[PDB]
Curated annotation (Swiss-Prot):
<feature type="repeat" description="WD 8">
    <location>
        <begin position="382"/>
        <end position="422"/>
    </location>
</feature>
<feature type="repeat" description="WD 3">
    <location>
        <begin position="148"/>
        <end position="187"/>
    </location>
</feature>
<feature type="region of interest" description="Interaction with U4 snRNA">
    <location>
        <begin position="11"/>
        <end position="13"/>
    </location>
</feature>
<feature type="repeat" description="WD 7">
    <location>
        <begin position="335"/>
        <end position="375"/>
    </location>
</feature>
<comment type="function">
    <text>The SMN complex catalyzes the assembly of small nuclear ribonucleoproteins (snRNPs), the building blocks of the spliceosome, and thereby plays an important role in the splicing of cellular pre-mRNAs. Most spliceosomal snRNPs contain a common set of Sm proteins SNRPB, SNRPD1, SNRPD2, SNRPD3, SNRPE, SNRPF and SNRPG that assemble in a heptameric protein ring on the Sm site of the small nuclear RNA to form the core snRNP (Sm core).</text>
</comment>
<feature type="repeat" description="WD 5">
    <location>
        <begin position="243"/>
        <end position="279"/>
    </location>
</feature>
<feature type="modified residue" description="Phosphoserine">
    <location>
        <position position="46"/>
    </location>
</feature>
<feature type="repeat" description="WD 12">
    <location>
        <begin position="587"/>
        <end position="627"/>
    </location>
</feature>
<feature type="repeat" description="WD 1">
    <location>
        <begin position="60"/>
        <end position="102"/>
    </location>
</feature>
<comment type="similarity">
    <text>Belongs to the WD repeat gemin-5 family.</text>
</comment>
<feature type="modified residue" description="Phosphothreonine">
    <location>
        <position position="49"/>
    </location>
</feature>
<feature type="repeat" description="WD 13">
    <location>
        <begin position="630"/>
        <end position="670"/>
    </location>
</feature>
<feature type="site" description="Interaction with U4 snRNA and with the 7-methylguanosine cap of RNA molecules">
    <location>
        <position position="610"/>
    </location>
</feature>
<feature type="repeat" description="WD 6">
    <location>
        <begin position="291"/>
        <end position="332"/>
    </location>
</feature>
<feature type="modified residue" description="Phosphoserine">
    <location>
        <position position="574"/>
    </location>
</feature>
<feature type="repeat" description="WD 2">
    <location>
        <begin position="105"/>
        <end position="146"/>
    </location>
</feature>
<feature type="site" description="Interaction with U4 snRNA">
    <location>
        <position position="339"/>
    </location>
</feature>
Length: 672
RNA sequence: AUUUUG
């Protein structure tokens, strides 16, 4: 019914690369973008289902976004600023997702930036060499400041005094400077002995001022401006588990006696500043809802219906939203740390979507979860490199085959917590395709086939993975009396009845083999470049003829469909060559990585392309229907949703998986 | 300290 996005992961090790404004809206830096999430009643979710929605992206930086800050000035909550390793500081209007203005004043890698709470157009940025720029964006003025020759980690403008900014450095130095007096140091706050991760001013004025600092030294220090000195030192607790530390802080403006911090392992704490190091652990009652790795940023968000929320970003690649009233996790938004290479829906558990990602974890998204739009489980054991191919077993629950960029083939039982079985035989190169099919000699119900970039297809016994795997080229050569070298295989696809195997090749040909012995019956010579994808039409359409239709894509843009009824039904004694397509689907402008048939229709195909779009075709009428342009990157995979005829999932090298509706797209065909 | 080639 509504689209969904699994976004790229929040960036790591940035003191402020996320923020939120009331109502409201949360933004997070992820790779070279900022993603925007509506949270609360404005998102428009059914009661019970978490009230958030991914709504937009700020696109325009060309390198890692290192900083993000909204304006917190009433009437301009739509303005924000970013910093980037591209050398720029950009001011954006999130209503239009466009840049208002920008500067390139820094000459060294920017560390962070902050929008002044007191001055409407002032953004203060700091870099790795210690240079600070004050930028009044709406009068075209700027001033450089240089305090100490040390790498800036964090900086926070005072909420009460427009001229005062606190800055924390890599060596543990903290200073309060006056920006109206050339950055003169007003207080030097001596105490920490390692990186400053966070500085939070006390949200009430006077005691002067209080400031809290969090450090890699595992302490939070509370400081007095009037004394120029530490008034309180809190050492983080050592708690049982449920990288080094990142210690970030949130000092709630409506509960000034409480201070929230991160902790070892990504636990969150609410400290009682009235008390003996008293804290309360977030999620102390419920199990498994805490982060599992360090938390980098904490962002308060008060919704329109006055719930107090706190958003957290983490090295574990989840964004969590915490209900401050109960300290329990309201919801979790998972994210991706690499390309989305592969998508596979289970035929056994409807709606269970495996995703192969370049960050070395398999995701299993329960897409049909009633109360959770983003119910995703992670599988990391035995994976350890980019997961470039996946295929669920067609009948055994939980049985997931996978393949990696290092040539490894494994088999998961996703219903257990056991590590996967690993094939003893490796491909020389990347595993591009996995498929289940009947066994063929010399193997003695389904075998697992794997195809590597080197061009070998292996047949594995899924009961004895650590045993022998067979190169099927021996059987092909014997059964067909072949004398010259076999082609370099680049794709395997079994027809839905299990009787016919198609192999795509580097030279563009597609060969059609029949069981039991992989007797060659047809060579299709249509593509002239490497075949990336083959898919046979399903068996439950309105005509039986349709299950003989085979779609294919190559490094060229044009897609072909072939109808193999006549050849398959004649079982010829010597093989036929086909050189004319049954249908031709033109429109894309770059290589085709994946094609899939709709299980809801007769002869409806979706294609994914390096042109950055996905295209729905009425293949039988050679008619382009719907073109999705939501990705920023090159598409690598596509799969139709199993229950909604209007909904498709696609994955790309933008580190995104999108779930989208054909009915909501405004174009019928790919860009020219 | 992750952010890259079906």
């Amino acid at each position: 019914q509504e689209p969904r996005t699994l976004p790229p992961s929040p960036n790591w090790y940035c003191a402020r690369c996320s923020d939120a404004v009331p109502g409201g809206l949360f933004g997070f830096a992820a790779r070279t973008s900022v993603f925007l999430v509506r949270v609360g009643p404005g998102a428009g979710e059914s009661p019970g289902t978490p009230p958030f929605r991914v709504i937009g992206e700020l696109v325009g930086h060309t390198e890692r976004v290192s900083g993000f800050t909204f304006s917190h000035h009433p009437g301009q909550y739509n303005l924000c600023a970013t910093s980037s390793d591209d050398g720029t500081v950009k001011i954006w209007d999130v209503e239009t997702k466009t840049v208002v203005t920008e500067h390139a004043l820094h000459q060294h890698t920017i560390s962070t930036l902050h929008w002044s709470p007191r001055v409407k157009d002032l953004i203060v940025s700091g870099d790795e060499k210690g240079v600070v720029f004050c930028y009044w964006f709406n009068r075209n003025d700027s001033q450089h400041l240089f305090i100490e020759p040390r790498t800036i980690f964090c900086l926070t403008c005072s909420p009460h005094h427009e001229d005062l900014v606190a800055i924390g450095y890599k060596d543990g130095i903290v200073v309060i400077i006056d920006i109206s007096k050339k950055g003169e140091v007003i207080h030097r706050l001596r105490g920490h002995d390692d990186e400053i991760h966070s500085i939070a001013w006390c949200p009430l004025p006077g005691e002067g001022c209080y400031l809290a600092t969090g450090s890699k030294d595992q302490t939070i220090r509370i400081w007095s401006c009037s004394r120029g000195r530490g008034v309180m030192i809190l050492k983080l607790p050592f708690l049982k588990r449920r990288e080094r530390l990142w210690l970030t802080l949130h000092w709630p403006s409506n509960q000034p006696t409480q201070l929230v911090s991160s902790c070892f392992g990504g636990e969150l704490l609410q400290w009682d500043l009235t008390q003996r190091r008293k804290y309360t652990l977030f999620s102390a009652s419920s199990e498994g809802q805490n982060h599992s790795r360090i938390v980098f940023n904490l962002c308060p968000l008060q919704t329109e219906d006055d719930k107090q929320l706190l958003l957290s970003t983490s090295m574990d690649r989840d964004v969590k939203c915490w209900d401050i009233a109960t300290l329990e996790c309201s919801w979790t938004l998972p994210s991706l740390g690499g390309f989305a290479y592969s998508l596979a829906f289970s035929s056994v558990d409807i709606g269970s979507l495996a995703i192969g990602v370049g960050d070395g974890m398999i995701r299993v998204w329960n897409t049909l979860s009633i109360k959770n739009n983003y119910d995703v489980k992670n599988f990391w054991q035995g994976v350890k490199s980019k997961v470039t191919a996946l295929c669920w077993h067609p009948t055994k629950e939980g049985c997931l085959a996978f393949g990696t960029d290092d040539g490894k083939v494994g088999l998961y039982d996703t219903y257990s917590n056991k590590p996967p079985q690993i094939s003893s035989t490796y491909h020389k190169k990347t595993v591009y395709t996995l498929a289940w099919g009947p066994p063929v000699p010399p193997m003695s119900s389904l075998a697992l086939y794997s195809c590597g970039g080197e061009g070998i297809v292996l047949q594995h016994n899924p009961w004895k993975l650590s045993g022998e795997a067979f190169d099927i080229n021996k059987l092909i050569r014997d059964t067909n009396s072949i004398k010259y070298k076999l082609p370099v295989h680049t794709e395997i696809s079994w027809k839905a009845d299990g009787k016919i195997m198609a192999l795509g090749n580097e030279d563009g040909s597609i060969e059609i083999f029949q069981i039991p012995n992989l007797k060659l019956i047809c060579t299709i010579q249509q593509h002239h470049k490497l075949v990336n994808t083959i898919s046979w039409h399903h068996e439950h359409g309105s005509q039986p003829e349709l299950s003989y239709l085979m779609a294919s894509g190559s490094n060229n843009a044009v897609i072909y469909v072939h109808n193999l009824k006549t050849v398959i039904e004649s079982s010829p004694e010597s093989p036929v060559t086909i050189t004319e397509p049954y249908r031709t689907l033109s429109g894309h402008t770059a290589k085709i990585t994946s094609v899939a048939w709709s299980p809801h229709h007769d002869g409806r195909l979706v294609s994914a392309s390096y042109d950055g779009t996905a295209q729905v075709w009425d293949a039988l009428r050679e008619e382009p229907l719907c073109n999705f342009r939501g990705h920023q990157g090159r598409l690598l995979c596509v799969a139709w949703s199993p229950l909604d005829p209007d909904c498709i999932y696609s994955g790309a090298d933008d580190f995104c998986v999108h779930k989208w509706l054909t009915s909501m797209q405004d174009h019928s065909r790919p860009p020219q």
